[PDB]
Design an enzyme around this catalytic site. Structure first.
Site, short mmCIF file in Angstrom:
data_model
loop_
_atom_site.label_atom_id
_atom_site.label_comp_id
_atom_site.label_asym_id
_atom_site.label_seq_id
_atom_site.Cartn_x
_atom_site.Cartn_y
_atom_site.Cartn_z
N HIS A 1 -29.00 26.78 16.60
CA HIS A 1 -28.81 26.92 15.16
C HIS A 1 -27.35 27.20 14.82
O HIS A 1 -26.88 28.33 15.00
CB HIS A 1 -29.71 28.05 14.65
CG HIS A 1 -29.79 28.13 13.16
ND1 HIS A 1 -29.81 29.34 12.48
CD2 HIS A 1 -29.88 27.17 12.21
CE1 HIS A 1 -29.90 29.11 11.19
NE2 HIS A 1 -29.95 27.80 10.99
N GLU B 1 -27.38 22.29 16.44
CA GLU B 1 -27.74 22.00 15.06
C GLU B 1 -26.48 22.23 14.23
O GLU B 1 -25.73 23.18 14.47
CB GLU B 1 -28.88 22.91 14.59
CG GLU B 1 -29.40 22.65 13.17
CD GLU B 1 -28.50 23.21 12.07
OE1 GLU B 1 -27.87 24.26 12.30
OE2 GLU B 1 -28.43 22.61 10.96
N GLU C 1 -28.30 18.53 9.80
CA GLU C 1 -28.95 18.86 8.55
C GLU C 1 -27.98 18.53 7.44
O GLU C 1 -26.86 19.05 7.42
CB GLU C 1 -29.29 20.35 8.45
CG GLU C 1 -30.26 20.60 7.30
CD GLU C 1 -30.49 22.06 6.97
OE1 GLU C 1 -30.73 22.86 7.90
OE2 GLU C 1 -30.43 22.40 5.77
N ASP D 1 -24.61 21.75 10.07
CA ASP D 1 -24.77 21.52 8.64
C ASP D 1 -23.65 20.64 8.09
O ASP D 1 -22.48 20.85 8.44
CB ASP D 1 -24.77 22.87 7.92
CG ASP D 1 -25.81 23.80 8.48
OD1 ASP D 1 -27.01 23.43 8.44
OD2 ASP D 1 -25.44 24.90 8.96
N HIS E 1 -22.06 25.31 6.49
CA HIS E 1 -23.32 25.60 5.83
C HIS E 1 -23.34 25.83 4.32
O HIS E 1 -23.97 25.07 3.58
CB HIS E 1 -23.99 26.78 6.52
CG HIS E 1 -25.31 27.15 5.92
ND1 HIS E 1 -25.41 27.89 4.76
CD2 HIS E 1 -26.57 26.84 6.28
CE1 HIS E 1 -26.68 28.02 4.43
NE2 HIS E 1 -27.41 27.39 5.34
#
Lengths: 233, 231, 240, 235, 228, 233
Positions: free
Chosen positions: C7, C34, C108, C36, C49
């Site tokens: 994450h 992961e 993401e 953003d 993020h």
């Protein structure tokens, strides 16, 4: 030279969204006139901001719930002054009346995008017209029926000048004075090939000047007269 | 005044879809340059017309089956004049960076990935000075979905009526043959529609060039920039 | 054996979404990083993020309003610790190239141009080892018509039913909370559906990590690769 | 009771796609009238079959290259008979208003703007007593996204199966050849799908007309309203 | 003539969304049976309104997380003479109702493709119409089955002329207050729409109003009254 | 290792698209069974290639025009040999039921309702073990809109470039010919695009079989599983 987009016509001196408010704006030098579209219970296109007749007419209740025959009989100018029983204009006439005299910034509130497309196409006013709407339903609808139309997105929603075209399929970006000032915002909008319109409905001559001064293509205002004079300089 | 659209670049005196042909047309007064684009086996965007390499290069077979590394090898000028031996099959990539700021671009998608074309143009910031078209419905649908805002054009032969160039084919620009440019009502119908108008000529007849320069046309798709510049 | 999805990098010991948090995550045995994505005022894909630079950088305001040239200026580590004084805000550009051949990536989309993302991944040849998700319905639909074939995931919280992850949400990967993992039929339904399973934890209770590692789960979306990797090595021995 | 659909009107006694042809058909007993929509160079919806004025008017060339001004000038009747020298090319505008309340309308888009059609029809409140079709995929998809609520049909030749008329072509009506009608499976299958049934004919064999009237069909896309009209009465 | 749409059966006299409430209402003269559909974790359609099992079952939690198997177990009659009543699978419930009445299907949250296939298989297209408060469910079904009959409430469409032009529906639903307003029914007829009125109110005086009005459907919560 | 895709079933030993032809295929070591689907006049999905019932049954006429009731009663083996007297045209219903757990299924739509297919495969939980294709753009667009998730293939002949198998045809599987398989850059490009690779042969030159089996190929669309199978052993 920054063009003037009259937000609902000469709003301060005439009943908003009226041939008078509109004609007055054209006098004060407006280059474009902005209007709001709604549909009668029986499928007719009218020019009126609110969902209900209450605030700006002799009638009450949802415009969507009333038939046009009745609507065509309402007073839409007496609430402003007795000097005005102006009518809730039909997009039919209102546009035909504006055709050739100015550009029209059409904002859909809630109506049939097909009827709007068919009408604007009939009148031959595609080039000189651009669209927007806070209703996603309306945007998607118009986006599916009329991709070729000029439309705009606000930096507020687009999050970035680069996404106005890419994500919101618009060719025009509306920004506030604060955003206008931010250095990169204009350079970015320009890199993206967007026309740039700034929204400002106040009296500060200084703000008007600063805008007429910046690298902006339009000003959506509530007082054309002021900006027109500032443009005079 | 009518703007000049160089079809595959000044191809009458240079290899088509080459930097040479393009810089040539540019020097002969071109306002825009038209391209042809296909994608390599490994996803690279190239400026070439035919589906295969045979005709305009020393290679052979479908461009979609050769790796970019082998393609950047070929000669895209030999076939034309010995005076063109280096001539490479340009990469949309470098080809657009070059023109970026010197002219406008008319990108005709032969068969490739629309997403890569939109990603590319949006990155170079060449959205305002480009327009598209394709004879492949697949390509147009893809592009229409990926970049509605992009300026595009439809021909009159396909649209059937100017009232349908924008309404049905979502085009902002309409292209017509000189004959159609003659029919009194066509140019007027298009203007009613609010389209930009472009005529495909690219002939030798300096009279037709003057006739088009006379008519209410916006662009003229050409094979001979030289002639029209004079007029 | 369960794959590890880091994450936003090893954020507990390094500035999240930073080449540092990532390299750490790799060195610690993560199979996926992961990240953003958001877009600068001028259209450059960045790894960050928040909607605003304030929290993880020394810059301020929306990233969507700042030019990449100034963005590349900012310091994305200093806030975490003096050791990271010059960490930059990764350009999805470089980041993905650095990760290619080293790990899988779970991308993401926060708010950006889907076309650019798909184009970039198709170019790096990273379509098999990447999967997508986004909380923005706008981003999802955009990527769904632009990249129908990419690998994507949906949360059970949103899909409502495992059978709707692929049916209604077009995803091939379902993400689940530890709690839903425990529900008898959930892992089974997801299996019937042909979905890959991922459990989001990122807490530090060794029990949970061992449980998850013990269940029928394909991935663990966590905040601490160090912990889960230990537990997994333990499983590896038995596997021998 | 089988309803009659007059293909381009009583084209067998009057110039096709003219009010003359429409009123004549209405009299021979027509329940519905069929038109073909084209669009002038300036976006005016006209009722004319061919892509060119040539065959049915004193004008020549593509209907799409001519301004409504000149189109409204053509003679869409003289070629058929001196009795109709006057005949004009009906604007969908007035043609529809003239039929509204007097008959149903089967609208087949040849090539035009789906949006203009959908707005016109909604404005005239003729949604219900009207249905659409087109051989142009561009045209059907355009209308399908703009007006999915409209009633539309699909020919079996294209749908392949009756269970695909609605499922794949989004149609509510299935058009069938007198042949396909005979197969006992075809009709029942159509009914299972909840479809309306129309048989295209336009032949003069009183034989066929009788059979079609005989069958379990909803509409018959005719070319000779009079023939089937007589046959229906008898039943 | 005005038909009767039973809002998930005679929910007042029998357990809502049950074969019981369906039979009763159907027996009391109901023409249509409205039903709410959700999907189990393993993808089986089920008739039940709430998203969670609780309220009308001896089971708890989201329906979406339970296997059809265990769901079949539950008893959705208890909380109401009935006790062994089960949560109906759209399969049986639909087959059971075929030929005996129309069916107004309201998608709660499930796979539109399963619904379309089921209804297409059962030959129930012409006697059924849809709706859903879920934009997702509506777009899904709209793209999967454009041809199905569907309704939009005036509350959402804003104008009768927008029920079909924007929400692609052929059936408009309205409240009595709206029914009362003159030009509403008028505008609705101009748009060639079917008109339905929602009214789970026992005031037999309004049931009389609706009946005399130019409505096509009455989505009531008590069939009996309107049948009288 | 290379998975075997039985193109229509064991073609030279059992009537194509038959239960018998499928079980036989499984014996020769087939990993996948390719089918061809068509919808019956009354909405039943069946397994049969041709648009008509001539060439492979004792019946005649387009499959779409005949009811299921009837079709179910036909003979799909007699045409091949007296041995297969009685073979029935298989409903995709029971044919998939019968294959679930014993083989991968290559579902190629000929002309039927994509939603019916979609619902079926979803119910039987066979999403992971199947992939699809169709020469019919009509069928491809529909399945694509209803089930983007399903794995699908595209032939290089149509995609023009492995790099477009995904980007344009939204597929993860690319079927190529031995000829193209021999071309250098091809297989590599497909790998750069993360594609699964399948080769179509159906020939009996056992040399080629091994050429395909020794290649970086994941599937082989065969006409003779028996052969490739032994080349595998």
């Amino acid at each position: 030279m920054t063009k003037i987009v009259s937000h609902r016509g000469a709003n301060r001196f005439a009943p908003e969204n009226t041939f008078a408010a509109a004609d007055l704006a054209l006098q004060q030098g407006a280059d474009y006139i902005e209007l709001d579209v709604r549909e009668s219970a029986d499928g007719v296109l009218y020019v009126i901001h609110d969902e209900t007749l209450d605030r700006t007419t002799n009638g009450t209740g949802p415009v969507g719930h009333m038939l046009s025959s009745e609507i065509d009989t309402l007073d839409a100018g007496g609430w402003f002054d007795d000097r005005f029983g102006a009518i809730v204009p039909r997009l039919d006439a209102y546009l035909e009346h504006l055709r050739g005299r100015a550009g029209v910034y059409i904002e859909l509130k809630y109506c049939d995008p097909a009827k709007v497309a068919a009408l604007v196409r009939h009148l031959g006013m595609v080039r000189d017209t651009f669209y927007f709407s806070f209703s996603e339903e309306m945007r998607q609808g118009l986006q599916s029926i009329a991709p070729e139309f000029r439309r705009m997105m606000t930096l507020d929603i687009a999050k970035s000048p680069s996404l106005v075209g890419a994500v919101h399929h618009a060719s025009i970006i509306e920004i506030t004075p604060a955003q206008m000032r931010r250095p990169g915002i204009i350079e970015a909008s320009r890199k993206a090939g967007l026309e740039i319109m700034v929204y400002y409905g106040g009296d500060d001559m200084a703000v008007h000047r600063e805008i007429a001064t910046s690298d902006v293509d339009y000003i959506n205002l509530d007082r054309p007269d002021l900006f027109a004079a500032v443009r005079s300089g």
